[PDB]
Amino acid sequence: ASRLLLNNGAKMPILGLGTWKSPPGQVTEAVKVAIDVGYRHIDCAHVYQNENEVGVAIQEKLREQVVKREELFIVSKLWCTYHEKGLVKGACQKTLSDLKLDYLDLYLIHWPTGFKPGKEFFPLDESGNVVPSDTNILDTWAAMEELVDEGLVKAIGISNFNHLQVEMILNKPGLKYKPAVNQIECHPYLTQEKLIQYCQSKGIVVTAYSPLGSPDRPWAKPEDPSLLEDPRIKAIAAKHNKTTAQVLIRFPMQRNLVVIPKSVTPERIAENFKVFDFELSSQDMTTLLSYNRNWRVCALLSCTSHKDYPFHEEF
Ligand SMILES: NC(=O)c1ccc[n+]([C@@H]2O[C@H](COP(=O)([O-])OP(=O)(O)OC[C@H]3O[C@@H](n4cnc5c(N)ncnc54)[C@H](OP(=O)(O)O)[C@@H]3O)[C@@H](O)[C@H]2O)c1
Numbered sequence: 541a542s543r544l545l546l547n548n549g550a551k552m553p554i555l556g557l558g559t560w561k562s563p564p565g566q567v568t569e570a571v572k573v574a575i576d577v578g579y580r581h582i583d584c585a586h587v588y589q590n591e592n593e594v595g596v597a598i599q600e601k602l603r604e605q606v607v608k609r610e611e612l613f614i615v616s617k618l619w620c621t622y623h624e625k626g627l628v629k630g631a632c633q634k635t636l637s638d639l640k641l642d643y644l645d646l647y648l649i650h651w652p653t654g655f656k657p658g659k660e661f662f663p664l665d666e667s668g669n670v671v672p673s674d675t676n677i678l679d680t681w682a683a684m685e686e687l688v689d690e691g692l693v694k695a696i697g698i699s700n701f702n703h704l705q706v707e708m709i710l711n712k713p714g715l716k717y718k719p720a721v722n723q724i725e726c727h728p729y730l731t732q733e734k735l736i737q738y739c740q741s742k743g744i745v746v747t748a749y750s751p752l753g754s755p756d757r758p759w760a761k762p763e764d765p766s767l768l769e770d771p772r773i774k775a776i777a778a779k780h781n782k783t784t785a786q787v788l789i790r791f792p793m794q795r796n797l798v799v800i801p802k803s804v805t806p807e808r809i810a811e812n813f814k815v816f817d818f819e820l821s822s823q824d825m826t827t828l829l830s831y832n833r834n835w836r837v838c839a840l841l842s843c844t845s846h847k848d849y850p851f852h853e854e855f
């Protein structure tokens with residue numbers, strides 16, 4: 541229906557609101573609107589630099605009695621500069637303090653790559669290479685497991701992990717908690733068929749990020765493809781009397797993925813939720829899958845020699 545079962549027994553809403561690039565001055569209103577029109581899943585991160593303002597909106601709607609806390613599914617992520625085992629708890633507590641919550645529904649390792657700890661989110665050397673930390677995936681995972689044991693988070697997962705990285709965790713000797721979710725970039729130009737098959741086969745729920753192709757991403761080039769403007773996808777939308785955005789959001793839902801489109805624009809927040817009253821056909825699905833180009837929008841050149849860089853592998 542509208543939620544997917546996780547390995548902890550919780551039900552994760554299949555549609556959530558993304559908040560990357562939602563400025564602090566606009567995100568509070570965005571979240572308020574989203575909760576009013578039915579969103580019950582918000583995707584957050586420390587690196588988005590807006591958790592306080594998301595937290596404001598959630599607090600206001602709890603106090604207004606619009607929703608109760610157990611009806612909300614709040615996700616955040618551990619940033620790359622906090623992979624050291626001793627920094628993980630503090631990072632989670634900082635996120636909880638900013639969001640004004642006492643627990644998260646889901647906390648992800650944001651990227652498999654640890655960066656040098658410090659004030660800078662992207663510590664670069666003078667030649668522009670990211671500076672790694674001497675952290676590894678398995679030790680970071682162990683610190684994430686402690687958060688569940690301490691009741692700060694209900695479920696833990698990963699983001700931007702390739703299948704070998706997922707495998708590494710699943711095969712961890714003394715594994716305490718299996719990853720619940722892998723959050724990955726997924727859209728018609730990067731359909732992720734092998735990694736989705738892998739993760740679903742392993743009972744890991746997949747969340748599709750950048751489902752509209754992140755047209756506001758800060759490194760977009762003029763000559764880059766644009767999903768929302770793809771005349772072929774416009775044609776599918778017109779046939780169903782829907783928008784291109786609604787098709788792009790429905791697409792992952794029919795693959796049994798969670799999807800988290802971002803908007804700060806109230807009309808679009810509402811538009812993006814109106815995706816439960818139509819179905820894409822088998823032909824439409826096949827057609828959208830056929831647009832795959834292995835075109836990835838979320839990666840940084842500056843990280844490509846990190847030992848744990850995820851996107852050298854086929855999947
Ligand atoms: N785990 C990770 O590493 C990671 C990476 C990337 C993204 N994410 C998550 O996934 C979320 C979504 O990805 P994203 O932010 O990259 O991009 P996206 O959701 O693919 O696209 C957002 C862009 O599309 C616009 N838009 C939204 N609804 C629209 C509609 N109905 N019609 C036309 N334009 C529309 C937004 O404009 P306005 O906001 O101005 O309306 C914004 O410019 C993020 O916000 C974040 O929560 C996670």
Ligand SMILES: O=C(O)Cc1nn(Cc2nc3cc(C(F)(F)F)ccc3s2)c(=O)c2nccnc12
Binds near residue numbers: 560838848850
């Ligand atoms: O991380 C997100 O959820 C979205 C996001 N993506 N990016 C592109 C990035 N790409 C990467 C790539 C790596 C990698 F794992 F080394 F591959 C590690 C960290 C990053 S962050 C930003 O530069 C970035 N900068 C600020 C805030 N968010 C971002």
